[PDB]
Structure 1
Amino acid sequence: DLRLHLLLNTSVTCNDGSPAGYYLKESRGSRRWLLFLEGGWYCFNRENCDSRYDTMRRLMSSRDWPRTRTGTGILSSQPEENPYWWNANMVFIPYCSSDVWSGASSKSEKNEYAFMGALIIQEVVRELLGRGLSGAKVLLLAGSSAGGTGVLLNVDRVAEQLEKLGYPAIQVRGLADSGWFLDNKQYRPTEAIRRGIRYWNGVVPERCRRQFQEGEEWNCFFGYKVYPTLRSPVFVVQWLFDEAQLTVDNVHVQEGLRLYIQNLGRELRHTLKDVPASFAPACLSHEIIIRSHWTDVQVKGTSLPRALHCWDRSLHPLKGCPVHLVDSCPWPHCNPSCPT
């Protein structure tokens, strides 16, 4: 069980002005810290956000959050469930800003909602330093789906924050799960993100912003465009046939659709060729790192917990302990270890 703490700075808020927060389970024998960003789509205008407030309110408000949460997958403290980091300090940061973790806008007489995702991450880090994060040797910022994209948008800002506060010894790293999308043509999207960025006052990493320039910041939401600009080490986990990617592509089998699906897997593989820490199985699925059975899937005979352990060793190629693992077979579930 991870225990809830509402932010002491009550001006850093969820969408409806209630305080944001985090769930924590400390491990005082460990100098490793895992901060996980929840996912859950987003909203991009007044009418769409009002609908989300009616039926997805826990993603917009802390008023109904429970006092505890069970850690699962990479957040589990049991070695059998989490071979990688079972002894780490565990943090789950609820997603209550509806802005893919990019926003920096308060509620006001001109704004019905607050979009503060980027500031929530910064404030959680600041308040954790008093609870033991000051002694860390590794801070791993992880996340799934919208939270995976949030890792790519925020990992370098956390590194800069800790350096400027005077903690140069904490190594900041990222783990992005199911947050690596393609801006491809549909079988039968980017405009919603463009409108969202303006609605949220959304912010993107500085080097990527300088490349694409004013009005084109939406480009930095796409992994293959923002990843080369990042300085912190980032491990990318991405199913080749991700269900959210197919949903946005309007895919729900004849020759035209067969070619479309094969092309999607080929393009995704291409974008990961120069990503040296990555795990990309040929499966139709969505998210992995906080699922209890995340230990089951393998690429070339290597599980995800093993690949992550090999990554840790590389940050001290390694015989028998690979870090770049991308399937080459071209159809969903051509890998026999895919979830069923």
Structure 2
Amino acid sequence: DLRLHLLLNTSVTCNDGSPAGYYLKESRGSRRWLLFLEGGWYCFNRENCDSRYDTMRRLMSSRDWPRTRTGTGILSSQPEENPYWWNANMVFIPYCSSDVWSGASSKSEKNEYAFMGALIIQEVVRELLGRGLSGAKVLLLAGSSAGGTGVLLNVDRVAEQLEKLGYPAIQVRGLADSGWFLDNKQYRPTEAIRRGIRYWNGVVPERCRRQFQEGEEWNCFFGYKVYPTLRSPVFVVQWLFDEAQLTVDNVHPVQEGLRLYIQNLGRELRHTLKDVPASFAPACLSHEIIIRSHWTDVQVKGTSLPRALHCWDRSLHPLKGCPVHLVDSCPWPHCNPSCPT
């Protein structure tokens, strides 16, 4: 179990002004730290956020959070469930800012809601340094779905923060799960992100911002455009036929037009990963993420994700029998036999 700590700086808040926080389980015999960003879509205007506050309030407020949570998948401390990092210090950061972890705007007389995702990450890091993070050798910033996009938006800022605070020896890396999307044509989204950024006062990584310039920062929410600008090592996990991608594309006995659409989506996703040396991209239709208990089951070319992550660690000290670039080439969902059911 990971136990809840509300932030000591009570000015860093969830959407409704309640304090943000983190769940922590320490492992005093380890210098590895895993900080995981929860996902859960986003909201982009007053009316849309009001609806989310009625029926998804835990994603907007800490008032009802439980005092503990169970670590599962990559957050599990049991070797049988987590062959990769079972002995690490474990941190789960709840998503209560509804801004894809991009915001830096407080509640005020002109703002009904606070959007502080980028500042929540920074304050969690600062408060952890006094609880043992100051002695870390590796800080892995991981996340799923909106949290996976959040990794891409925040990993280099964490590295810069630690350098400026005087901790040059901590190696910052990122693990982005299910957060690598395509701004493609629908079968039958980018505007919502564009409007969201203005509503949240959202921030993007600086090199990407300088490429796309004023008004075009929404481009930096798309993995294939932001990834080449990043300096920290980042491992990308993405299903070739991701269910959230297909939902926004309006895809739900398949005839020719839809067959060609789905095959082209998989080919485009595979193309965007060709120059990503650390990646795991199975040919499956899924919404499943790396904090699920059976995350060890899927394999690409005979290699599981926990193994690929271990090979990535070794590469950062190609390796015989220890691959890090694993992208399926077969062209239809479940052509990989190990896909989840």
Residue 144 of structure 2 is matched in structure 1 by: 144
1:286 Cα deviation (Å)?
1.5
C-alpha separation between the residues in 1 aligned to 2:113 and 2:124? 20
Percent identical: 100
For residues 267-295 of structure 1, what are the alpha-carbon distances to aligned partners after superposition, in whole Å with 9 as ceiling and x for unaligned?
00000000000000000002421000000
SS of residue matched to 1:86: coil
Maintained 8 Å contact 1:36/1:91? yes
CA distance in 2, matches of 1:115, 1:136: 29
| Maintained 8 Å contact 1:145/1:287 | no
Distance in 1, matches of 2:259 and 2:316, equals 40
1:20 partnered with 2:1:
no
Calculate the TM-score normalised by the size of structure 1: 1.00
Q: Is the 8 A contact 1:16 1:60 kept in 2?
A: yes
1: distance between equivalents of 2:243 and 2:104?
A: 29
What is the Cα deviation at residue 132 of structure 1?
A: 0.1
Shift of 1:160: 0.0
CA distance in 2, matches of 1:124, 1:313: 28
Q: How does 1:1-340 map to 2 (within 5 A)?
A: 1-252=1-252, 253-340=254-341
Unaligned 5+ segments in structure 2 are none
CA separation in 2, counterparts of 1:189 and 1:101? Answer: 17
**Residues of 2 paired with 1:167 and 1:154: CA distance?**
18
Deviation at 1:33, TM superposition (A): 0.1
> Deviations along 1:48-70, whole A, 9 cap, x unmatched?
00000000000000000000000
Cα distance, 1:317 vs structure 2: 0.2
| Whole-angstrom distance in 2 between the partners of 1:286 and 1:300 | 21
Tell me the TM-score normalised to structure 2 length.
1.00
Which portions of structure 1, spanning 4 or more consecutive aligned residues, are displaced by more than 2 angstroms?
none
Q: For 2:150 and 2:85, how far apart are their aligned partners in 1?
A: 21
How far off is 1:89 after superposition? 0.1
Superposed CA offset, 1:113-139 (max 9, x none): 000000000000000000000000000
Q: SS of the counterpart of 2:34? A: strand
| Conserved? CA contact 1:122–1:158, under 8 Å | yes
Unaligned runs of 5+ in 1: none
- How many residue pairs get aligned? The number is 340
Deviation at 1:43, TM superposition (A): 0.2
CA distance in 2, matches of 1:181, 1:286: 13
Residues 177 and 287, structure 1, Cα contact 8 Å, conserved in 2: no
Secondary structure, aligned partner of 1:174? strand
Instruction: State how far apart, in whole Å, the 2-side matches of 1:226 and 1:333 are.
Output: 29
Q: What CA distance in whole angstroms lies between the structure 1 residues aligned with 2:74 and 2:262?
A: 30
